[PDB]
Design a protein around this ligand. Structure first.
Ligand SMILES: O=c1ccn([C@@H]2O[C@H](COP(=O)(O)OP(=O)(O)O)[C@@H](O)[C@H]2O)c(=O)[nH]1
Lengths: 496, 4
């Protein structure tokens, strides 16, 4: 009985979905159910990126699995430099301003080696050259130490084919490529597994094979990176139970519920809905829309993507905004709001945490309106727990939203909120006159009036802040555990 | 040209 959360990889900076997959793993750990993260892409850094969040036992990477490197950890470091000098009698030439070396057999140039670290304990790649200095092969090293993939080059350093090795050096997978729109596209895959050879045309067919090899009767799969995982499960049998998790809005236009096409990333799942046992969304509002859109052809269930768990409310009057600096969030309006408010409340300040394209434009409107000591673009911040202790109110002025971990955390710190009434997320975390207020989309005047009203009524802000503590508590770890356990119990018995 |  194993529960597989299938995303794609883990980066250095975790995306929303990667965060959601890890958080679901942690809950399943506590609850006591077997869970692992399944990753699909080839990433010879995955073990480093993962180390700060999960254990080697906690995930199976597809390429690690067929390279017999699942659960493996770091080798003892290996002095490549002395191997090449003392054992091989090669001549090494450090490149300045880098962690690189050219490697020579006397006058002959052999190899170009990139080390990751400046202590040269993490060999990253090594390029090989023929007698005409043509670069013929690239050797790509896993951070754990072994040579993970060799890549054969043609023409202008174009990728022709790749070989993937277990740590002892045996070839376990082959891949062949042809270029399309300037980029290599897979045209074949060979896999050496079970003392046999297996053949495929693309990486969706290999994933489907991967999935089948993990499946024992009783297992449960979760499609979390549906642009990739949904085409894969669509090529595996219906006897293998799988739940589609959506992690954003399901349609290109939220304003045409009945008719808007589904988002591109969810098309293949929605076109083969009977493959999946259920869909999981993060809000009750989105559960209701998807249920109606699919005509209840399968269960839809809302389970939040995050949970709630320092001094708070230590109250100048601090407004806050935790939002990427992007068009959707319409952060200028928050500047406009402050423009009007400072004349009535001049001890006011508005801290906007996040980053993005729209920073320059936002800095300008600050200068234009003389608010430089009232509106601060504070950038991205690794933890905001100190920033929340003295926040009077938070503001959301976006035109489209999703369930916000940030909003959930801010409500755990007693910070009430005023938000436009847009989908999705606001309505999930914000009961009007309980922990904040919901405003009609783009009503900058009702926004002003409601923001003004709470400032002029601290005792209201107390109620709202107490309501935010009450709101947060409904998203407890144990609340999420209970939903998840129930959902898994119910899904598996219907699939009996 | 020798690095990537
Ligand atoms: O400046 C920032 C902005 C966001 N976050 C964190 O990003 C997470 C996800 O927030 P949200 O869902 O708003 O991010 P989005 O998915 O919109 O980028 C939350 O835990 C926030 O605390 C942060 O630490 N600092």
């Amino acid at each position: 009985s194993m529960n597989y959360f299938v995303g794609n990889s883990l980066g250095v900076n975790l995306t929303g979905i990667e965060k959601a997959i890890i958080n679901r793993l942690n809950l399943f750990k506590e609850m006591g159910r077997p869970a692992q993260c399944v990753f699909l892409s080839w990433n010879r850094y995955l073990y480093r990126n993962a180390q700060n969040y999960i254990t080697s036992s906690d995930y199976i990477n597809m390429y690690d699995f067929f390279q017999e490197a699942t659960y493996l950890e770091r080798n003892e470091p290996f002095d490549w430099l002395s191997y090449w000098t003392d054992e091989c009698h090669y001549t090494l030439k450090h490149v300045e301003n880098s962690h690189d070396f050219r490697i020579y057999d006397q006058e002959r140039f052999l190899m170009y080696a990139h080390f990751q670290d400046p202590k040269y304990r993490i060999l990253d790649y090594v390029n090989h050259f023929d007698s005409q200095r043509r670069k013929v092969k690239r050797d790509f090293y896993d951070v754990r130490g072994f040579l993970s993939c060799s890549r054969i080059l043609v023409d202008k350093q174009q990728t022709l084919c790749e070989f993937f090795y277990n740590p002892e050096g045996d070839t376990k997978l082959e891949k062949y490529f042809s270029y399309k729109d300037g980029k290599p596209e897979v045209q074949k895959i060979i896999v050496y597994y079970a003392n046999k050879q297996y053949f495929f045309n693309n990486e969706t067919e290999l994933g489907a094979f991967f999935i089948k090899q993990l499946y024992q009767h009783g297992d449960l799969f979760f499609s979390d990176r549906n642009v990739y995982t949904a085409p894969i499960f669509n090529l595996t049998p219906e006897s293998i139970p799988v739940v589609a998790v959506l992690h954003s809005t399901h349609i290109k236009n939220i304003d045409a519920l009945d008719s808007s096409p589904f988002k591109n990333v969810y098309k293949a799942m929605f076109e083969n809905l009977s493959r999946y046992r259920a869909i999981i969304v993060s809000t009750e509002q989105q559960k209701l829309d998807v249920e109606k859109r699919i005509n209840h052809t399968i269960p839809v269930v809302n389970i939040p993507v995050g949970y709630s768990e320092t001094p708070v409310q230590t109250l100048s009057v601090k407004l806050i905004s935790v939002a990427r600096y992007s068009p959707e969030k319409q952060l200028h309006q928050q500047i406009e709001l402050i423009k009007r408010l400072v004349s009535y409340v001049p001890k006011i300040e508005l801290h906007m945490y996040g980053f993005g394209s729209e920073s320059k434009k936002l800095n300008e409107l600050i200068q234009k309106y003389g608010l430089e000591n009232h509106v601060y673009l504070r950038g991205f911040l690794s933890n905001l727990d100190q920033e929340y202790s003295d926040a009077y109110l938070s503001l959301i002025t976006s035109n489209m939203e999703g369930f916000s971990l940030a909003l959930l955390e801010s409500l755990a710190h007693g910070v009430p909120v005023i938000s436009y009434d847009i989908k999705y997320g606001p309505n999930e975390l914000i009961t009007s006159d309980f922990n904040g207020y919901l405003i009609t989309k783009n009503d900058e005047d009702a926004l002003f009036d409601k923001v003004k009203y709470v400032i002029d009524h601290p005792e209201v802000q107390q109620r709202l802040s107490k309501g935010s503590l009450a709101k947060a508590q409904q998203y407890s770890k144990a609340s999420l555990i209970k939903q998840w356990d129930q959902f898994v119990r119910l899904i598996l018995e219907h699939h009996h | 040209s020798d690095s990537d």
